[PDB]
Amino acid sequence: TRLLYYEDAYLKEAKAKVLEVKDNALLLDQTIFYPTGGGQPHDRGWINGVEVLDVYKDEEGNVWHVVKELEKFKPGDEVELKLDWEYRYKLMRIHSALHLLENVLDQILGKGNWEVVGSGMTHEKGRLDVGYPENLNAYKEKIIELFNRYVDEGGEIKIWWEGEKRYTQIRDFDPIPCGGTHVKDIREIGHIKKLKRSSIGRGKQRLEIWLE
Ligand SMILES: [Zn+2]
Ligand SMILES: [Zn+2]
């Protein structure tokens, strides 16, 4: 599949051709719908005004779109794609926030002194599970301050590829390899509304992040 969302994360609408109709799902030649991966949920939206129920990649890498009304789709149809942009852009803000939070933790705790244990997000909040001994409640204020300062200063998020791995880099910070859709500039993330730390195991800590 041609993954238009990796050519332009801000492409909100596009046209596509139906290649196959298999299992309540449409295979398109190109798509703007992000399929589930990298901790980021799949996009919501509409194809010809029909609700999209799921977007996933098959074992060959191609993207299938489950639709709620199959009857009006046949191979060869030209269809109009429309993202649920409110949902997509909130996920871009939260995904980029998780990257910025990682870079902030490198600055404050030291690269190599902590580990990412897991990562995920919803429309509501992002989750970064970390391996670090000391209770991070003693660092929360400084983390929030530095995060918000970088948001205020701004900075481009650059994208490139190395093999099958997509890389993103905020400003000159350490690059972070992962799939998913990011804002263009960290000014768009906005300030932290809430950062919540919890213990999830010995030396394992969950950071949950909500944006304004
Ligand atoms: Zn990521
Ligand atoms: Zn603010």
Short mmCIF file of C-alpha atoms and ligand atoms in Angstrom, two decimals:
data_model
loop_
_atom_site.label_atom_id
_atom_site.label_comp_id
_atom_site.label_asym_id
_atom_site.label_seq_id
_atom_site.Cartn_x
_atom_site.Cartn_y
_atom_site.Cartn_z
CA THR A 1 0.00 0.00 0.00
CA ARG A 2 1.14 3.57 -0.63
CA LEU A 3 1.16 5.09 2.86
CA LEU A 4 0.18 8.72 2.26
CA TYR A 5 0.15 9.42 5.99
CA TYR A 6 3.94 8.98 6.00
CA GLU A 7 4.28 11.42 3.06
CA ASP A 8 2.11 14.05 4.80
CA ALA A 9 0.74 13.70 8.34
CA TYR A 10 -1.52 16.71 7.67
CA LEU A 11 -3.25 15.28 4.59
CA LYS A 12 -6.84 15.10 5.90
CA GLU A 13 -8.66 13.93 2.74
CA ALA A 14 -7.61 11.96 -0.32
CA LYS A 15 -8.89 9.82 -3.17
CA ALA A 16 -8.07 6.14 -3.63
CA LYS A 17 -8.95 3.12 -5.79
CA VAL A 18 -10.42 -0.07 -4.33
CA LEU A 19 -8.18 -3.04 -5.24
CA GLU A 20 -9.89 -5.82 -3.24
CA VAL A 21 -12.96 -6.39 -1.08
CA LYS A 22 -12.25 -9.45 1.06
CA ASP A 23 -13.48 -9.71 4.66
CA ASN A 24 -15.74 -6.71 5.34
CA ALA A 25 -12.56 -4.78 4.49
CA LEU A 26 -11.25 -2.64 1.63
CA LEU A 27 -7.73 -2.89 0.24
CA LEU A 28 -6.84 0.46 -1.35
CA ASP A 29 -3.96 1.40 -3.60
CA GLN A 30 -3.10 4.30 -1.26
CA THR A 31 -4.42 5.51 2.08
CA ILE A 32 -4.28 8.26 4.67
CA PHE A 33 -5.63 5.97 7.42
CA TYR A 34 -2.97 5.06 9.97
CA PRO A 35 -3.12 1.34 10.92
CA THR A 36 -2.67 0.25 14.53
CA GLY A 37 1.00 0.10 15.50
CA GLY A 38 3.78 1.53 17.61
CA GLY A 39 1.44 2.16 20.54
CA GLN A 40 -0.69 4.56 18.41
CA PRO A 41 -4.31 3.52 17.73
CA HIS A 42 -5.63 3.32 14.19
CA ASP A 43 -7.29 6.35 12.64
CA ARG A 44 -11.02 6.93 12.67
CA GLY A 45 -12.83 8.38 9.69
CA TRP A 46 -15.04 7.71 6.69
CA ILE A 47 -14.76 6.23 3.20
CA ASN A 48 -17.51 7.56 0.90
CA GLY A 49 -19.26 8.70 4.06
CA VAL A 50 -19.19 5.18 5.57
CA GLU A 51 -17.75 4.67 9.07
CA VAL A 52 -14.35 2.97 9.26
CA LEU A 53 -14.34 0.28 11.98
CA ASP A 54 -10.71 -0.88 11.87
CA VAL A 55 -7.48 -0.23 10.00
CA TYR A 56 -4.73 -2.85 10.14
CA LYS A 57 -1.75 -4.12 8.18
CA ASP A 58 -1.70 -7.70 6.83
CA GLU A 59 1.45 -9.85 7.15
CA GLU A 60 2.56 -8.51 3.67
CA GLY A 61 2.38 -4.86 4.84
CA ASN A 62 -0.81 -3.92 3.00
CA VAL A 63 -3.50 -1.87 4.75
CA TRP A 64 -7.07 -3.15 5.10
CA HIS A 65 -10.00 -0.88 6.05
CA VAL A 66 -13.01 -2.46 7.75
CA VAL A 67 -16.18 -0.57 6.81
CA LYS A 68 -19.59 -0.54 8.48
CA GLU A 69 -21.52 -0.64 5.14
CA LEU A 70 -19.91 -3.01 2.65
CA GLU A 71 -22.68 -3.10 0.05
CA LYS A 72 -21.65 0.05 -1.85
CA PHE A 73 -17.99 -0.90 -2.50
CA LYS A 74 -16.61 -2.94 -5.42
CA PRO A 75 -13.13 -3.45 -6.88
CA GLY A 76 -12.19 -0.56 -9.13
CA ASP A 77 -14.35 2.00 -7.32
CA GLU A 78 -12.83 5.42 -6.75
CA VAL A 79 -13.48 6.34 -3.13
CA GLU A 80 -13.08 9.50 -1.06
CA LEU A 81 -11.06 9.15 2.16
CA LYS A 82 -11.71 11.49 5.09
CA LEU A 83 -9.94 11.33 8.44
CA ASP A 84 -11.57 12.02 11.75
CA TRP A 85 -9.13 14.91 12.07
CA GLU A 86 -9.96 15.82 15.67
CA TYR A 87 -9.01 12.28 16.69
CA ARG A 88 -5.92 12.13 14.45
CA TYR A 89 -4.46 15.48 15.52
CA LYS A 90 -4.93 14.75 19.22
CA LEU A 91 -3.00 11.50 18.67
CA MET A 92 -0.25 13.38 16.83
CA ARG A 93 0.07 15.80 19.75
CA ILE A 94 0.19 12.98 22.29
CA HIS A 95 2.58 10.85 20.29
CA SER A 96 5.01 13.73 19.84
CA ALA A 97 4.59 14.54 23.56
CA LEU A 98 5.75 11.01 24.43
CA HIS A 99 8.89 11.51 22.32
CA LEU A 100 9.57 14.91 23.90
CA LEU A 101 9.07 13.39 27.35
CA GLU A 102 11.67 10.71 26.55
CA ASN A 103 14.17 13.34 25.44
CA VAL A 104 13.40 15.38 28.57
CA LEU A 105 14.10 12.30 30.72
CA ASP A 106 17.44 11.85 28.96
CA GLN A 107 18.35 15.45 29.79
CA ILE A 108 17.26 15.21 33.43
CA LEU A 109 18.17 11.61 34.36
CA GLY A 110 20.98 10.97 31.85
CA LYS A 111 20.85 8.88 28.69
CA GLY A 112 21.55 5.30 29.65
CA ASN A 113 20.46 5.80 33.27
CA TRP A 114 16.84 4.81 32.60
CA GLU A 115 15.04 2.49 30.18
CA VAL A 116 11.77 2.59 28.26
CA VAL A 117 9.79 -0.46 29.40
CA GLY A 118 6.68 0.27 27.33
CA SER A 119 4.78 3.00 25.54
CA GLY A 120 1.23 3.61 24.33
CA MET A 121 -1.48 6.20 23.97
CA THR A 122 -5.16 6.91 23.58
CA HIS A 123 -7.04 10.04 22.59
CA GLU A 124 -7.12 10.90 26.34
CA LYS A 125 -3.53 10.39 27.48
CA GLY A 126 -0.10 8.99 26.73
CA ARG A 127 1.70 6.31 28.75
CA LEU A 128 5.46 5.90 29.15
CA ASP A 129 6.58 3.02 31.40
CA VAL A 130 10.16 3.46 32.56
CA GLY A 131 12.82 1.54 34.43
CA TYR A 132 14.33 3.86 37.03
CA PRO A 133 14.89 3.21 40.76
CA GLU A 134 14.26 6.58 42.43
CA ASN A 135 10.62 7.65 42.75
CA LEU A 136 10.11 10.15 39.94
CA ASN A 137 7.71 12.28 42.00
CA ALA A 138 10.88 14.07 43.14
CA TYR A 139 11.56 15.01 39.50
CA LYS A 140 8.04 15.74 38.25
CA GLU A 141 8.17 19.53 38.56
CA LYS A 142 11.50 19.79 36.73
CA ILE A 143 10.28 17.38 34.03
CA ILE A 144 7.13 19.46 33.45
CA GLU A 145 9.09 22.74 33.45
CA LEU A 146 11.63 21.57 30.89
CA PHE A 147 8.98 19.94 28.68
CA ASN A 148 6.91 23.15 28.71
CA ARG A 149 9.98 25.31 28.08
CA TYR A 150 10.85 23.30 24.96
CA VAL A 151 7.24 23.60 23.77
CA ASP A 152 7.48 27.38 24.25
CA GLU A 153 10.76 27.56 22.30
CA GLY A 154 9.47 25.29 19.54
CA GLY A 155 11.49 23.01 17.32
CA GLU A 156 11.03 20.97 14.16
CA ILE A 157 10.41 17.23 14.31
CA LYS A 158 12.47 15.71 11.50
CA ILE A 159 11.63 12.35 9.90
CA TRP A 160 13.77 9.87 7.99
CA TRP A 161 14.14 6.14 7.36
CA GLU A 162 16.88 3.58 7.96
CA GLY A 163 15.75 0.32 6.40
CA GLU A 164 12.31 -0.67 7.64
CA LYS A 165 12.66 1.62 10.67
CA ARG A 166 11.25 5.12 10.68
CA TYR A 167 13.14 7.66 12.78
CA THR A 168 11.97 10.95 14.31
CA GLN A 169 14.15 13.62 15.87
CA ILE A 170 13.08 16.66 17.86
CA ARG A 171 15.52 19.54 17.34
CA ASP A 172 19.00 18.11 18.00
CA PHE A 173 17.89 15.63 20.68
CA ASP A 174 18.45 11.86 20.43
CA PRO A 175 16.48 10.29 17.55
CA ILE A 176 13.66 7.90 18.45
CA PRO A 177 12.78 5.05 16.00
CA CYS A 178 9.08 4.21 15.68
CA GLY A 179 6.01 4.21 13.39
CA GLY A 180 3.24 6.75 13.88
CA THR A 181 2.19 10.27 13.02
CA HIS A 182 3.83 13.33 14.57
CA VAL A 183 3.20 17.07 14.58
CA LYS A 184 5.51 19.25 12.49
CA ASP A 185 6.85 21.34 15.39
CA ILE A 186 6.81 20.76 19.14
CA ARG A 187 5.10 24.13 19.66
CA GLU A 188 1.93 22.27 18.56
CA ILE A 189 2.12 19.81 21.48
CA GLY A 190 1.13 22.50 23.95
CA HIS A 191 1.69 22.52 27.68
CA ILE A 192 1.25 19.58 30.00
CA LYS A 193 -2.12 19.60 31.78
CA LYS A 194 -1.23 16.69 34.05
CA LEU A 195 1.71 14.34 34.48
CA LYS A 196 0.98 11.44 36.83
CA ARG A 197 3.58 9.02 38.18
CA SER A 198 2.67 5.62 39.61
CA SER A 199 4.65 2.61 40.75
CA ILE A 200 3.98 -0.50 38.65
CA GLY A 201 6.73 -2.72 40.05
CA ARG A 202 10.09 -2.56 41.75
CA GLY A 203 12.10 0.02 39.85
CA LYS A 204 9.29 0.31 37.29
CA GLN A 205 7.32 3.54 37.04
CA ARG A 206 4.41 4.67 34.87
CA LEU A 207 4.23 8.25 33.58
CA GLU A 208 0.85 9.28 32.18
CA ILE A 209 0.67 12.57 30.29
CA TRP A 210 -2.38 14.72 29.45
CA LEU A 211 -2.10 17.82 27.27
CA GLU A 212 -3.91 21.13 27.55
ZN ZN B 1 6.75 6.82 18.88
ZN ZN B 2 -0.70 26.58 28.12
#
